[PDB]
Symmetry: C3
Amino acid sequence: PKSLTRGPRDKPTPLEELLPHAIEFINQYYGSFKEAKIEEHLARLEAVTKEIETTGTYQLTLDELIFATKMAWRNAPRCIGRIQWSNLQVFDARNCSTAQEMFQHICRHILYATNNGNIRSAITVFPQRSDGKHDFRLWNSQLIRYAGYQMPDGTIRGDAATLEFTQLCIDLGWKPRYGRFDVLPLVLQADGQDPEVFEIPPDLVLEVTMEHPKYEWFQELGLKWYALPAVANMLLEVGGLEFPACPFNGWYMGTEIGVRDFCDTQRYNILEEVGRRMGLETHTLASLWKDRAVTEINVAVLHSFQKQNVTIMDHHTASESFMKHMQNEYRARLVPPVSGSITPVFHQEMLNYVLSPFYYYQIEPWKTHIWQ
Amino acid sequence: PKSLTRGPRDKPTPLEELLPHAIEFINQYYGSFKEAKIEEHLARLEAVTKEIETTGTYQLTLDELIFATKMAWRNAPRCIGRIQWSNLQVFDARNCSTAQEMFQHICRHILYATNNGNIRSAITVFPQRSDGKHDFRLWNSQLIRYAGYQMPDGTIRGDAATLEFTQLCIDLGWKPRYGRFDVLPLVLQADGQDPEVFEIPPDLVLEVTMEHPKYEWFQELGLKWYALPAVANMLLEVGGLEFPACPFNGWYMGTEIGVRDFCDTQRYNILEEVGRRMGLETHTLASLWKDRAVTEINVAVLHSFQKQNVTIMDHHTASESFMKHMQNEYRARLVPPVSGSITPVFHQEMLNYVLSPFYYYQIEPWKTHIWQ
Amino acid sequence: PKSLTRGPRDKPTPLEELLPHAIEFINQYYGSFKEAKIEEHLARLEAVTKEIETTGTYQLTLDELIFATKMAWRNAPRCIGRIQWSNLQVFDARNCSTAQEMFQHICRHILYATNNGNIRSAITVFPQRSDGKHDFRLWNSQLIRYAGYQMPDGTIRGDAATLEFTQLCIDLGWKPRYGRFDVLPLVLQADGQDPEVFEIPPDLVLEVTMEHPKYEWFQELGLKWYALPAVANMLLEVGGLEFPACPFNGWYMGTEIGVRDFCDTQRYNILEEVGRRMGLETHTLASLWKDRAVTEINVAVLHSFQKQNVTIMDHHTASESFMKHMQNEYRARLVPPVSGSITPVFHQEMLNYVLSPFYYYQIEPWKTHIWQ
Ligand code: HEM
Ligand code: HEM
Ligand code: HEM
């Protein structure tokens, strides 16, 4: 995915690589207004140019930043959320200094975002990359996520996708409770310093208890998942600027909540216990009972969410949320095309088209971090 | 060409894969108007969202469809016709039910389109893809096209490009007349059912008799070609919707009418008979007589078309047709850029740019069709 | 770089390959005006269509050409100059006939562009490609550039990048002075004829003498470079038209002026002589003295330029030049997006996106030229 990965630097972005993008951005920004702000637009371009001339970089106005985060969301071709991009709360943390402070900002986010199940979308933007030596990073892939443990006999326990990170956490001093649903700690890096680990206050992590509307025994097999899907390891590019730390969140779809993960020895087990029900024939592969169980688990999940009043992207939600997004544009008194975000970028030997602003992937920090 | 091929499905398009595209389309549509229709635009987006919420899909207004077919034409980078996209007649057949009915619609098209040589561009849109199990398809590559037969000794007779399809037709019960210009039958598939074959009424197929302005013996070698170039196997994508059956037509260019196909034992023969003329030396390859003959055949073709008053895209035609297209826009009282059609699509692992609406290729039906 | 290379032809561009592009261009052009020129726009499209119909090609109005050169500059993703695209002087030489005349036009350019160090950006556009058999070409890569000689013992003398071209010049009758800073002659090709070589009048080539602000011995090692960076071998594509000869110029950045070219036996030598200074230890690779010297050479260069008052793209220059570019747009009483230049081009088997107008690379002429 190297195309969509924006890596680390060790020196500020050159003028010839910053100025053009800053200009394009500011034009894009001022081009959004129904009512033009000519005098302001020209003076801003001047301000920014002189600022890059004198300081070597530039700062975004809170309003420019807000716009950037929303546009980058609008420019996320995989995200169904891009549909209602105006429904985003932006938390400005560009004045942050330490991991201690990062944690507070992160807790505020979780708190705001969770809202007792009535999930709200938000993004916390930490200081932008300066020289690439003083980066702010969240080593975690997601704010909330279960630990994955490599058991002696070879089987995994917990989230199989977090094995490498869990190990890291252990190496960093985190005491592993060898359970199936252990919420991983936040590994926060501020000002390029070594990362610091913080346990996430249990009260802040809302979890959905799995139960089926028909099968009363469902709750007996003790399955649960966290309500907040928040990405922590991405980078926001905007007008040449780079924000290595800017975690955001949305809400689940329903059809994807991963553990029903039809994979290995993790899958098989939960799937057989199920057969206890209606299609009790788990002794043979003649009855494709697995199809029955999977379909039913999705039912238990969907049901669990709606009954525990935790927002999920069902058909009604998708439409209602989109309407709310349209109400915001109407009260403002046509949209700026997606085309207005495509920038021709000539990287080594090929003319390619890139979107900006945009949420890029990054290289896992421990792979590049230089220990103090 | 897998990039430009939109294949078969076996389940409706997911919400997260439909809604964004529907929205983008409706925005694109309402963005065309010189005079904005704010109240209507917002209510339409609402209507469609609620419709996808409740029905799982949506229907286009005839006017939206018309717009879609024209824009998709405008988005056909190979088609010189894209120059005058407003000159298109749209035949709505989204209410069609059987192959019997398809045939009637198809005959109407040919009739309208042929217009005794005064070729007119048209497109017949059949029902959109629902679950991918009830598809409408024209198994033919073109509405009108000559059969290709594999003779015992190995030589081919007729159109070499239609060998596989001709065989299919034979397998489907069509009696092969082993001639050089046998018009293939229409293999129509409706509502996902098995295809039904219909012979095309000879009166509907206009053919141009080949003759040279100077060589009176030209007509003696009995060469002819059909006047109507119509593609039958493409798919129209629009706002997430897919129309597997939507044949369209234009008119010939003159320089391409394929049989002068410098290929094998099919070519060589017609080319030698020619040498009977001005450069009678067909005993040696010292006189590049082939160049002489080819140039002359193109002359006979071009001449044949203009004398038999069958529209062909010559220099005058190109300009006149473009003017007619400009007269339509002027009477309406600036154009919406092509950029407004490019949509960033994140398919597996790569950020690519796609045009929409657009005419995609498809997989030959007999290769995927499940027999009843 | 074959993607970005527009090669030679031997027959005019076909209608189906010209008309669409001409139309798109003219639309793009008339779409720039703050004040629409409806009557003029429509009549122009008509004019051009009829012109291509009758003549087989079309001529651009000087104003359309000016626009084309500026937009193509705006569409040069590597060029920091694209920032101030309105600051361009266009020299129309589409009426040029001979190499003699080309030379005069080229001398005027150098003269205007050099302006005693106060560098000004300009472009000289020679006759457009007709049938591809009567091309105007500058065989040189740059208007001004030092010769590169392959010495007997194997070492190179001068610009290592110009070895093949220098040889060509020698073959063409140019007497090689075997120095380090010999300005190469102009190899001009007009109307598809054989190229003619012209020595560039020394008075026209402004050179910067290298000296350090602190080290008085710097001037002693006699280093110099030319002030004018001008590309001579590119092709401008616009509305389907192709201009094989259209040299342009800008000014240096400072950080790139190549000879500090850390390469072979050319590098090493100048680098050691340096060590004579502050870090005199050139006997060992324990002291990374090379880093010291390189940094210092860049200092001598930058200093040499500013003291000899030869324009260079430093931070102040970048901002000041951009302001000058904004003053031009303000006095005209929002910009047309970059997206409005992207054209979907279906070349063999793939749907790609191209920019237009644009400055393409070309195949080195001597590799394709047919001698008379
Ligand atoms: C409003 C609720 C939201 C929903 C339902 C939603 C849903 C999704 C889904 C389903 C995916 C793609 C598939 C997957 O990774 O599971 C995704 C990806 C993404 N979303 Fe969201 N999203 C929401 C909010 C957000 C917000 C608020 C932002 C940013 C401000 C955002 C940015 C992205 C990005 C950048 C991706 C790419 C993920 C990747 O490929 O690694 N999303 N979103
Ligand atoms: C008005 C007369 C028309 C002319 C002269 C014309 C001409 C052409 C030509 C010369 C090609 C490309 C080369 C070839 O395949 O032979 C082509 C391709 C195409 N045309 Fe047309 N066309 C016309 C009308 C139409 C119409 C009415 C539509 C659609 C509404 C259309 C859609 C397309 C598409 C989608 C292709 C792609 C064919 C492929 O690559 O398989 N054309 N057209
Ligand atoms: C105003 C001063 C200018 C500056 C500082 C400037 C600077 C540059 C730089 C730094 C590069 C890329 C890296 C390199 O090749 O060294 C470049 C490339 C380029 N510039 Fe300029 N440029 C200027 C003016 C122009 C003008 C006037 C035009 C055209 C009208 C232009 C067209 C291009 C093109 C087409 C390239 C691509 C070169 C290649 O990749 O081979 N530039 N310019």
